[PDB]
Coordinates of C-alpha atoms and ligand atoms in Angstrom, one line a residue:
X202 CA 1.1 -34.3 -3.6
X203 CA 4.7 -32.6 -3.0
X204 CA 5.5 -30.7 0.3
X205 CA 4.2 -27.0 1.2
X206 CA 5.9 -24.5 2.6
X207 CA 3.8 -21.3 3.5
X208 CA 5.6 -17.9 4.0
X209 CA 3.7 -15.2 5.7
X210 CA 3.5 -11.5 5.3
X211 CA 3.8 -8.3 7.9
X212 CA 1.7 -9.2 11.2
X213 CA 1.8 -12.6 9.9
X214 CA 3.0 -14.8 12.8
X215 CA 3.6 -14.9 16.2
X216 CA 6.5 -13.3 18.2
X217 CA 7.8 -13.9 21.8
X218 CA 9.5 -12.2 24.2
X219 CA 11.6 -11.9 27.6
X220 CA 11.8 -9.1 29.4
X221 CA 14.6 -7.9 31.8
X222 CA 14.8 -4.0 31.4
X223 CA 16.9 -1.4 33.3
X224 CA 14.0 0.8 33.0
X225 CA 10.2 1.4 32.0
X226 CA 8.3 4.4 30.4
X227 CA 6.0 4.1 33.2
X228 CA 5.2 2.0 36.6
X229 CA 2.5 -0.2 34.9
X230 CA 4.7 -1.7 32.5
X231 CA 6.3 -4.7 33.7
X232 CA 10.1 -4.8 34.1
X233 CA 11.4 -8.2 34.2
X234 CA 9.4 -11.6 33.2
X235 CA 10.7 -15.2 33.9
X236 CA 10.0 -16.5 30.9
X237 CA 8.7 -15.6 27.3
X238 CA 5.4 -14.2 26.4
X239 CA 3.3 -13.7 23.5
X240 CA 4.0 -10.1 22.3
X241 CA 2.3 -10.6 19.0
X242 CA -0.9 -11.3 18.9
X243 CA -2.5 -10.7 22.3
X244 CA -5.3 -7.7 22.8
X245 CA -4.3 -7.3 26.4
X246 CA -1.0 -5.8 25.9
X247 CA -2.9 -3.1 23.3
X248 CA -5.2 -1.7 25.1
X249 CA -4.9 2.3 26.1
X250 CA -3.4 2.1 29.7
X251 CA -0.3 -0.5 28.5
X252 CA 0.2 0.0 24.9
X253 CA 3.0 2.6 25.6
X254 CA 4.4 -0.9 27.7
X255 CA 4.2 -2.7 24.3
X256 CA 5.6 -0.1 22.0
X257 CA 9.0 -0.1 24.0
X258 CA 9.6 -3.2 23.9
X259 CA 8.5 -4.2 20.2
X260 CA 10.0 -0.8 18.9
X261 CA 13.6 -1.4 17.0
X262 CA 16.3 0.6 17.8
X263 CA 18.0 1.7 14.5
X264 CA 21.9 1.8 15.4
X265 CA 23.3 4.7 12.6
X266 CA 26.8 3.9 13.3
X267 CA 26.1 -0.5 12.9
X268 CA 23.9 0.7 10.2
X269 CA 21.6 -2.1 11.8
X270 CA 19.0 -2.5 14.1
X271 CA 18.6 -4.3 17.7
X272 CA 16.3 -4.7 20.5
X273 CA 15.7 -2.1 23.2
X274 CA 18.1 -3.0 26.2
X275 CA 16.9 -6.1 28.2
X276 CA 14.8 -7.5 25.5
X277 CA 14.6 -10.3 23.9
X278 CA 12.1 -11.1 20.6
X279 CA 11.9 -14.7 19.1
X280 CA 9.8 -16.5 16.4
X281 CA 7.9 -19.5 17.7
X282 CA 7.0 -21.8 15.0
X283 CA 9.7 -22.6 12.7
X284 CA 8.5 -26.0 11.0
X285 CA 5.2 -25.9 12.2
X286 CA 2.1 -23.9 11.5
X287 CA 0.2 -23.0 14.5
X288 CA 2.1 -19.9 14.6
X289 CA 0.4 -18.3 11.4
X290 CA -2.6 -20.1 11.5
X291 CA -4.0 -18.2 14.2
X292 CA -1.7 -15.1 15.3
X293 CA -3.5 -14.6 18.7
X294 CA -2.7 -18.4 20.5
X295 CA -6.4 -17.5 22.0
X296 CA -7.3 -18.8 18.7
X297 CA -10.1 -15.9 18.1
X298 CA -11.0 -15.2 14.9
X299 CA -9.8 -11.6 14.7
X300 CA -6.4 -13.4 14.6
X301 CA -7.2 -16.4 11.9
X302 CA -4.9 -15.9 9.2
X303 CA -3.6 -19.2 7.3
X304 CA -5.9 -21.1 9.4
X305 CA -8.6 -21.6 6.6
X306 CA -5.8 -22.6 4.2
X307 CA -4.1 -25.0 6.3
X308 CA -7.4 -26.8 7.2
X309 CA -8.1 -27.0 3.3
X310 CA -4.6 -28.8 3.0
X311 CA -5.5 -31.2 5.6
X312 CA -8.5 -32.0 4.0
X313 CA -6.6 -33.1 0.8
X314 CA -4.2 -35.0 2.7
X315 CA -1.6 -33.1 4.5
X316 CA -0.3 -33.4 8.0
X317 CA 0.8 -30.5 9.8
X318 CA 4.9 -30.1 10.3
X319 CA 5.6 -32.7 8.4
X320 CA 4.4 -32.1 4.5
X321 CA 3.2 -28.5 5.2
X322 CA 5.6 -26.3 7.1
X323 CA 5.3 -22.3 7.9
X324 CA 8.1 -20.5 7.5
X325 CA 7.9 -17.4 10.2
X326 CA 10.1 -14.8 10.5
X327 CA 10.6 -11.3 12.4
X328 CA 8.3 -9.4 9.7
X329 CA 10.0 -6.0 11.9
X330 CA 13.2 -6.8 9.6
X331 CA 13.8 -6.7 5.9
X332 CA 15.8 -9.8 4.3
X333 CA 19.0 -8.3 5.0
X334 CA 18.9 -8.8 9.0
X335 CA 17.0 -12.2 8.8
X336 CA 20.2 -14.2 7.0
X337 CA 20.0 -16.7 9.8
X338 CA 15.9 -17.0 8.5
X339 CA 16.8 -18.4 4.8
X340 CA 19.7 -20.6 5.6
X341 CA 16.8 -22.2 7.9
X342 CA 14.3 -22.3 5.1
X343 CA 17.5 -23.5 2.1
X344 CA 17.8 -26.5 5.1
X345 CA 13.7 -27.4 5.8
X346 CA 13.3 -27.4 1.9
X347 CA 15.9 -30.1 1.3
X348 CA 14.6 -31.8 4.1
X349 CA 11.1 -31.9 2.8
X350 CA 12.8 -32.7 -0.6
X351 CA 14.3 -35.9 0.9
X352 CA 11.5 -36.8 3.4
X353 CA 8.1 -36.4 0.9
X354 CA 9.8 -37.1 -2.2
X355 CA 9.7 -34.5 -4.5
X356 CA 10.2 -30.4 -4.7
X357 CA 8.5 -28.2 -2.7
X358 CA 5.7 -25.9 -3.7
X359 CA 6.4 -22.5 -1.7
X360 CA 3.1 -20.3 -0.7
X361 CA 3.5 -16.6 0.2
X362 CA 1.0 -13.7 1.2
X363 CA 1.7 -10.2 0.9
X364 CA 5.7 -9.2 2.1
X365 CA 6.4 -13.4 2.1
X366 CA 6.9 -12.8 -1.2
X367 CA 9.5 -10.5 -1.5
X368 CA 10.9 -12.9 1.1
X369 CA 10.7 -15.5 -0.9
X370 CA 12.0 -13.7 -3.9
X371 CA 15.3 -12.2 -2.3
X372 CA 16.1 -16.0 -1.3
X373 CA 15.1 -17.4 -4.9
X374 CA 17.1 -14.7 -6.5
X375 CA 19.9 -15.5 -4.0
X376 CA 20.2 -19.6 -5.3
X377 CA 22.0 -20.9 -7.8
X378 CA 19.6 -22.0 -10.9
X379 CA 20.4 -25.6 -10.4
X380 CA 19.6 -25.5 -6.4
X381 CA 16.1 -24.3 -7.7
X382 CA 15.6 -26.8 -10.5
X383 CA 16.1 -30.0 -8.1
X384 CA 14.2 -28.7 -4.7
X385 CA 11.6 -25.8 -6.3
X386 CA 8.6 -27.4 -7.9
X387 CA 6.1 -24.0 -7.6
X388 CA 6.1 -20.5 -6.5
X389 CA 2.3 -19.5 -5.5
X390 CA 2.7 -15.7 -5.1
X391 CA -0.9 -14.5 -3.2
X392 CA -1.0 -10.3 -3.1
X393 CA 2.6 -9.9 -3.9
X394 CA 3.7 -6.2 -3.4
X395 CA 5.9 -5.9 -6.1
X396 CA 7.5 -2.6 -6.3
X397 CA 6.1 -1.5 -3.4
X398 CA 2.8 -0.1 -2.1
X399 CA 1.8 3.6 -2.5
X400 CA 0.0 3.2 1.4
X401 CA 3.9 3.0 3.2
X402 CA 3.2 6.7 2.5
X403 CA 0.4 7.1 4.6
X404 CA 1.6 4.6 7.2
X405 CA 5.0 6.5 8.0
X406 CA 3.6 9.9 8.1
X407 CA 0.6 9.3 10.2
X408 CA 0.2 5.9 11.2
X409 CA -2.1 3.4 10.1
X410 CA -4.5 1.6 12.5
X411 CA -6.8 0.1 9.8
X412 CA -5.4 -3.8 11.0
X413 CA -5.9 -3.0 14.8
X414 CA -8.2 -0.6 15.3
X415 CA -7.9 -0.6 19.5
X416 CA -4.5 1.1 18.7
X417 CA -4.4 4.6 17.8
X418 CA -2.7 5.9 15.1
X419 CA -0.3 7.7 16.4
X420 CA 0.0 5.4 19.0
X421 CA 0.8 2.5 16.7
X422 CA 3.4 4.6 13.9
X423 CA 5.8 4.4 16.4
X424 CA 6.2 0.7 15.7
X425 CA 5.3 1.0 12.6
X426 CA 7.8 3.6 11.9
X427 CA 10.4 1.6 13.9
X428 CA 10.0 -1.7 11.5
X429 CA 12.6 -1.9 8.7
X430 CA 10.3 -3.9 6.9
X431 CA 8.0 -0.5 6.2
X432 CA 10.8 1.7 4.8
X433 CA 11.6 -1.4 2.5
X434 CA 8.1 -1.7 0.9
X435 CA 7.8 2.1 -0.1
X436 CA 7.6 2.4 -4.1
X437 CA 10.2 1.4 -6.6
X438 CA 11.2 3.0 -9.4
X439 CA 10.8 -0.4 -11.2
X440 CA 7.0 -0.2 -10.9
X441 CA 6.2 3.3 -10.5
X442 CA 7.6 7.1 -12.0
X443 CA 9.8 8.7 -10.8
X444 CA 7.7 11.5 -11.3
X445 CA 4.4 10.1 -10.0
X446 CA 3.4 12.3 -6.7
X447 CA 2.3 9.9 -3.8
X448 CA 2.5 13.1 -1.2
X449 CA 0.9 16.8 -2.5
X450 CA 1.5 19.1 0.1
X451 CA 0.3 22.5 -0.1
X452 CA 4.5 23.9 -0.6
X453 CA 6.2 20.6 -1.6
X454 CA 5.8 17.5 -3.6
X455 CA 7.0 13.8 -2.7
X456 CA 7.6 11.7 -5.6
X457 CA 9.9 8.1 -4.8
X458 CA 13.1 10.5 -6.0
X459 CA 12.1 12.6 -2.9
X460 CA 12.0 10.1 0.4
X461 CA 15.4 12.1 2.0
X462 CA 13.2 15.6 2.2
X463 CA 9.6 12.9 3.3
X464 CA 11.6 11.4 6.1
X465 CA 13.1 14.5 7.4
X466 CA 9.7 16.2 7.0
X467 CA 7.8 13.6 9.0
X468 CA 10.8 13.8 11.7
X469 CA 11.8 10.3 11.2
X470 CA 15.3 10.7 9.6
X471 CA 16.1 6.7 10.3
X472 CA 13.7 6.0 8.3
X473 CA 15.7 7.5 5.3
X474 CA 18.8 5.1 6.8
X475 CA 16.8 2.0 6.2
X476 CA 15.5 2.7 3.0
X477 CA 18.8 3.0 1.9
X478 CA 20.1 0.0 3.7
X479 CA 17.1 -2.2 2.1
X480 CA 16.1 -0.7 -1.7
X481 CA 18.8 -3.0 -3.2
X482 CA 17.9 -5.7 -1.7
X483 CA 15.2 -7.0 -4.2
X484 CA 17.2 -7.1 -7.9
X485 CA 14.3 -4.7 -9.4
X486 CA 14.9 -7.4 -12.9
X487 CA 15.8 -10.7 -11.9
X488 CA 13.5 -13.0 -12.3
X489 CA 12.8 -15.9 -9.5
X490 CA 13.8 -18.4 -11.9
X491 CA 10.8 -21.1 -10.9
X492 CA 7.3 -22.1 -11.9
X493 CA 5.4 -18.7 -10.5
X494 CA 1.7 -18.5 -10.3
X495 CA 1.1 -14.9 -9.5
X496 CA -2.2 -14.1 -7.7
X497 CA -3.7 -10.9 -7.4
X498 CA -6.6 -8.6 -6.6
X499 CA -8.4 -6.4 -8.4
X500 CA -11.6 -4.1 -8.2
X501 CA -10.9 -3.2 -4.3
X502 CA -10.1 0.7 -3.9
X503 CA -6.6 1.3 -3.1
X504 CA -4.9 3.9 -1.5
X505 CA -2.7 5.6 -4.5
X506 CA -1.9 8.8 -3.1
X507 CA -2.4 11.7 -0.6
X508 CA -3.1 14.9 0.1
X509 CA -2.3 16.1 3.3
X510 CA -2.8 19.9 4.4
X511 CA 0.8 19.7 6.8
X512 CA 2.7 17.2 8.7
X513 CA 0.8 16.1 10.7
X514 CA -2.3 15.7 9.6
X515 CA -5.3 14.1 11.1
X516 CA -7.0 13.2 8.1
X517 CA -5.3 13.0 4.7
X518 CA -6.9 13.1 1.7
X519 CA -7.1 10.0 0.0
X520 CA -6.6 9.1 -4.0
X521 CA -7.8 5.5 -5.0
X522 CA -6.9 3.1 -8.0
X523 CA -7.5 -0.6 -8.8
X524 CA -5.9 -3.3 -6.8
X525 CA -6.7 -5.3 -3.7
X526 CA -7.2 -2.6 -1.2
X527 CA -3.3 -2.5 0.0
X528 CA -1.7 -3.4 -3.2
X529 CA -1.9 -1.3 -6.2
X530 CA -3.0 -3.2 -9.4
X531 CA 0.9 -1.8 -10.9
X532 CA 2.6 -4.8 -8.7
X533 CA 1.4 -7.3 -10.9
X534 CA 2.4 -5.8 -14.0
X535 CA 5.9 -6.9 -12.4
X536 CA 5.0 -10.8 -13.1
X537 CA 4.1 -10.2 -16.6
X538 CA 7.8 -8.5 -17.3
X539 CA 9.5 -12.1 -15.8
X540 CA 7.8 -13.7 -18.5
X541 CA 10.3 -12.7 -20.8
X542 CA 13.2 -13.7 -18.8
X543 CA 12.6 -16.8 -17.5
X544 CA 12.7 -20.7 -19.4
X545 CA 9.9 -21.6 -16.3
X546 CA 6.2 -20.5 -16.9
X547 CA 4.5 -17.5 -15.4
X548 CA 1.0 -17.8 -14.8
X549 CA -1.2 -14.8 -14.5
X550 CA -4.5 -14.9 -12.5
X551 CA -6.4 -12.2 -11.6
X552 CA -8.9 -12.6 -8.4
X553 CA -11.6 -9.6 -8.9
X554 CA -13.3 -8.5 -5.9
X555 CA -10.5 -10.3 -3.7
X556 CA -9.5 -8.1 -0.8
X557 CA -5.6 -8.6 0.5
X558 CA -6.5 -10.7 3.4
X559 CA -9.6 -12.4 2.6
X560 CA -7.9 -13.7 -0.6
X561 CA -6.1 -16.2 2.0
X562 CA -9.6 -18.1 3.3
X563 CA -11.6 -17.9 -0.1
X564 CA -12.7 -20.6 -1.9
X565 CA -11.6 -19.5 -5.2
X566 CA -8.1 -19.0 -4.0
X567 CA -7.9 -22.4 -2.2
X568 CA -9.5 -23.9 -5.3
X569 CA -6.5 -22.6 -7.3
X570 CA -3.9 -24.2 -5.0
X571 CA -5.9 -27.4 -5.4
X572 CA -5.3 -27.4 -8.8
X573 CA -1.8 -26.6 -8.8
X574 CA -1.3 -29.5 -5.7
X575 CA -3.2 -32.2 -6.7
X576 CA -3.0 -31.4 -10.7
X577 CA -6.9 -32.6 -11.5
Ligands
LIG616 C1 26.0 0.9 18.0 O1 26.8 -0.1 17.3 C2 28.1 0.1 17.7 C3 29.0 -0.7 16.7 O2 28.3 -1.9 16.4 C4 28.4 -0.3 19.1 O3 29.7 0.0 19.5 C5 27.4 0.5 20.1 O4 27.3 -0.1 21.3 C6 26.0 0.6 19.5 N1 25.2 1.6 20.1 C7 24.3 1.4 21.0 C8 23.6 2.6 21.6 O5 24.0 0.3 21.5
LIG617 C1 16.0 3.3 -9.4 O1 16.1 3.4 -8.0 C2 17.3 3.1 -7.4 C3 17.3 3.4 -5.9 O2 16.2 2.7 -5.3 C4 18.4 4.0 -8.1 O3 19.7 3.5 -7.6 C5 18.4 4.0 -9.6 O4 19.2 5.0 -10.1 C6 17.0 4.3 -10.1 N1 16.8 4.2 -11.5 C7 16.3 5.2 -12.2 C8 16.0 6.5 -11.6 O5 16.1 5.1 -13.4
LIG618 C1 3.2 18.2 -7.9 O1 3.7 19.5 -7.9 C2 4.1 19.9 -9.3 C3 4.9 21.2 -9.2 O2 5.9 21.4 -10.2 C4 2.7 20.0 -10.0 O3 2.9 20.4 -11.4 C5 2.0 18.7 -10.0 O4 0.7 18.9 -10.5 C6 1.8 18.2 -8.6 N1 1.1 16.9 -8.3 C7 0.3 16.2 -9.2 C8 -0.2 14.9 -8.7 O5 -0.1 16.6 -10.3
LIG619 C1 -13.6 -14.7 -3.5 O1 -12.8 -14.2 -4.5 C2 -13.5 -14.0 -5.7 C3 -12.5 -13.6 -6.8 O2 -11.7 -14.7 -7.2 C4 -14.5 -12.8 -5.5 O3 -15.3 -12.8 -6.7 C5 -15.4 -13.1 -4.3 O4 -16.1 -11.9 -4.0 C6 -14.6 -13.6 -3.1 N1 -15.5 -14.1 -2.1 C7 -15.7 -13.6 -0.9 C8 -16.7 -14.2 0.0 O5 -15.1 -12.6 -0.5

């Protein structure tokens, strides 16, 4: 069976961090810590009294003159993980359900015959970033791939969720056709937001707490807000139209021609900054030039547009059309168009009634991979 690597998707592993701060936002939040902690995922740091604490120091601080962003003075965020899997198995190191993300998966590998960090490998990265401030990220994965290449004997099948796969396209876009031939043997794509997702609307203007419900919306936008990776998934022009309205307002329209006059509206001008330093990132054509088995959700209500009353809004009205509750069913349409420009097959397989998350820990997913693994 040839070597795994799995990529995960926004929230998706665990982050760290060291604290020494000039200054706090108030007395209970600790100042200076002697070694690293788990910022992502552990409940404590969330609840009411502290998450203010957490904010400021998982907040990014967007730098308009850099054109980049970097962490709030005295702190310091790292990826545990690299190689390993623990890390997005289970995203609280607790190991409490709430957090159990690849952890079904990765037992199911096991099961067939793989051993952890060494066939099977995650692939973290700081999901706050888009792929353009995570270079040092893919020159790590290019390296683990031709090590796995060497060590297990054959090409590597790569396993995204969610943003992993716009990860994982921006690197296979980004190597040569040959590199791909000799060390890629499959591309599993699982919820790929292609395009974009019509909720990054909702999410910017007035938070979204649906993941973590102990945090309060407006509470957790700020991060939300301050993550690169957010701006970069609103919709593309690629998949959607440029006339398609994903805000109605009662005096003013946003379409994806219109995010300038959005982020100023919301009062979040950076925003506006990072889109622009991200939407080229993805080539909106290119194919990823590999075997791609594209995975995806249908006949779960998504959020396809909103109405809201002002900015802001406590409730916004919601639209719905077909997808996998956070992707629209219009991402996969994106697959079907690399058909035509690729020599490597692209398989299509729809999942109906397959939620975005739980699509990772069901059976009929797993018993997809199987197939494509172990070839019965
Ligand atoms: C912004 O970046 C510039 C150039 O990289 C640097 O001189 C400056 O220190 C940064 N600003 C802040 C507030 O750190
Ligand atoms: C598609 O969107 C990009 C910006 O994301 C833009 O540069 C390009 O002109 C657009 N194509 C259209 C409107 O046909
Ligand atoms: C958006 O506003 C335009 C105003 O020219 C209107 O015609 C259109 O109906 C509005 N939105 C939608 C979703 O139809
Ligand atoms: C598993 O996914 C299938 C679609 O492939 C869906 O029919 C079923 O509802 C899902 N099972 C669970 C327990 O969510």
């Amino acid at each position: 069976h040839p070597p795994v690597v799995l990529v995960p998707g926004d929230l998706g592993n665990q982050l760290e961090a060291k604290l020494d701060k000039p200054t706090v936002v108030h007395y209970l939040c600790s100042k200076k810590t002697e070694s690293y902690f788990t910022i992502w995922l552990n409940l404590e740091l969330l609840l009411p009294v502290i998450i203010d604490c957490w904010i400021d120091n998982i907040r990014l601080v967007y730098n308009k003159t850099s054109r980049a962003t970097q962490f709030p003075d005295g702190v310091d965020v790292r990826v545990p993980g690299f190689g390993k899997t623990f890390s997005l198995e289970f995203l609280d190191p607790s190991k409490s359900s709430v957090g159990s993300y690849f952890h079904t998966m990765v037992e199911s590998l096991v099961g067939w015959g793989y051993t952890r960090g060494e066939d099977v490998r995650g692939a973290p990265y700081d999901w706050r970033r888009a792929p353009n401030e995570n270079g040092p990220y893919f020159l790590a994965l290019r390296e683990m791939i031709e090590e796995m290449y060497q060590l297990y004997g054959g090409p590597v099948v790569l396993v995204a969720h969610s943003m992993g796969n716009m990860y994982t396209l921006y690197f296979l876009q980004r190597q040569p056709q040959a590199w791909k031939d000799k060390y890629i043997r499959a591309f599993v794509s699982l919820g790929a937001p292609w395009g974009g997702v019509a909720k990054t609307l909702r999410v910017l203007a007035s938070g979204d707490n649906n993941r973590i419900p102990v945090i309060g919306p407006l509470k957790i936008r700020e991060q939300q807000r301050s993550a690169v990776s957010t701006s970069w998934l609103l919709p593309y022009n690629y998949t959607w139209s440029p006339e398609k309205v994903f805000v109605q307002t009662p005096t003013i329209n946003y379409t994806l021609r219109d995010y300038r006059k959005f982020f100023q509206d919301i009062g979040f001008e950076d925003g506006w900054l990072m889109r622009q330093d991200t939407e080229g990132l993805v080539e909106a054509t290119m194919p990823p030039g590999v075997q791609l088995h594209c995975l995806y959700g249908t006949g779960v209500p998504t959020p396809d547009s909103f109405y809201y009353e002002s900015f802001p809004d406590r409730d916004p009205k919601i639209c719905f059309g077909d997808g996998d509750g956070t992707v629209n069913l219009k991402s996969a349409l994106q697959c079907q168009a690399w058909q035509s420009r690729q020599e490597h097959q692209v398989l299509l397989q729809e999942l109906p009634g397959s939620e975005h998350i739980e699509m990772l820990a069901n059976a009929t997913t797993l018993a997809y991979l199987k197939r494509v693994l172990l070839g019965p």
